[PDB]
Amino acid sequence: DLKSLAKRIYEAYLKNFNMNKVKARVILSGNNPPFVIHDMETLCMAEKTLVAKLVANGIQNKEAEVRIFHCCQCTSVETVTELTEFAKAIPGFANLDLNDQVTLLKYGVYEAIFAMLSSVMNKDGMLVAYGNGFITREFLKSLRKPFCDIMEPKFDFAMKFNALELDDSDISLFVAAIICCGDRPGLLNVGHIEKMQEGIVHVLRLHLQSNHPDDIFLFPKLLQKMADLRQLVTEHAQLVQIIKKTESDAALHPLLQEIYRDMY
Ligand SMILES: CCCCCC#CCC#CCC#CCC#CCCCC(=O)O
């Protein structure tokens, strides 16, 4: 039954996420290839084609850094939607109380977002806009503070995560395991969530043993990556709060504001 469950998780991940690691590698390796954004000129060209509405305001357009942060937030919002539908494939998740489903998604979504962002990152940049742009790591580092500090730690996480050479069948179960953490603040039925976690982690452990016979420590490596992601998200929320306090034009999407609210 456990091999079947791993396959059901994988198929739900292929169905629910617009981007997966195979589809990202096809693009990253060179009809509508991605537009390369490496400087302000190419950012502005890409925006005029790919997010025309955001730059249709003339002198009232926001600063480039704010537009970029807005685009990242739109990606997070879309990924929340995808993750919410994916979670239904996890045994036991849809049987939880509605409020526990909300709590698990609230704390898990950004950990999952940053885990999956690795699939669209290489050491030089990241795919954006449904695979139609590639923005360079150096260009993001060149932005004015604090905005140059947003993505770089996510690239740092991703380069080491990508060196584990996981595939989509692994990542789907890793994302399911992120969502099933029984220690999230405020859960009502911890016991049932712990059992749900145990089940998915069991599926993950057996799958990794099969799919990665060459790396006997891959399971504990991934347990550590889950802890690293929790710390990455805590730090990310702190930076977002700095932006909220000091950057009046950098409007936070209400869905994301709610996710952040009372989180850490
Ligand atoms: C025309 C396309 C222009 C591309 C502009 C760009 C770009 C860079 C990018 C990107 C994809 C992403 C993402 C998820 C995230 C995050 C953390 C921050 C948001 C949040 O706090 O939610």
Name the β-bridge partners of 36: 134
44, 50, 239: which is closest to 139 by C-alpha?
A: 44
Distance 221 CA to ligand 1 centre (A): 27
Write the DSSP symbol of residue 252: P
Please, which residues have CB within 8 angstroms of residue 178's CB and are 6 or more apart in sequence? Answer: 108, 111, 112, 115, 226, 229
> What type of residue sits at position 103?
T
Packing angle, helices 64-86 and 2-16, rounded to 10: 140
The atom of ligand 1 lying closest to the CA of 49 is 1
Method: X-ray
Annotation-wise, does 13 bind a ligand?
no
Residue spans of the domains in the chain: they are 1-264
Q: Looking at ligand 1, which residue's alpha carbon is closest to its atom 5?
A: 68
262 torsion bin: left (phi>0), alpha (psi -120 to 50), beta (else): left
Asked whether 176 lines ligand 1 (CB < 6 A), one says no
Distances (CA, A) of 130 to 32, 141, 243, 249: 11, 22, 26, 25
Helix (H, G, I), strand (E, B) or coil at 151: coil
Mark residue 86 as left, alpha or beta (left: phi above 0; alpha: psi -120 to 50; beta: remaining). alpha
Alpha helices in 137-260 (DSSP H): 137-142, 152-162, 168-179, 190-211, 218-246, 254-260
Residue nearest to atom 6 of ligand 1 (CA): 68
Using DSSP's 3-state secondary structure scheme, residue 154 falls into helix
CA of 173 to the centre of ligand 1 (A): 24
C-alpha span between 201 and 196 (Å, rounded): 9
Q: Are the beta carbons of 193 and 108 closer than 8 angstroms?
A: no
The residue contributing the CA closest to ligand 1 atom 13 is: 72
Ramachandran region, residue 34 (left: φ > 0; alpha: ψ -120 to 50; beta: rest): beta
Q: Cα(first)–Cα(last) distance of the chain, in Å?
A: 37
Residue closest by Cα to atom 11 of ligand 1: 72
132 within ligand 1 shell (Cβ under 6 A): no
| Ligand 1 and 240: CB distance under 6 A | yes
For residue 12, the 8-state DSSP code is: H
Which atom of ligand 1 is the closest one to the Cα of 151? 17
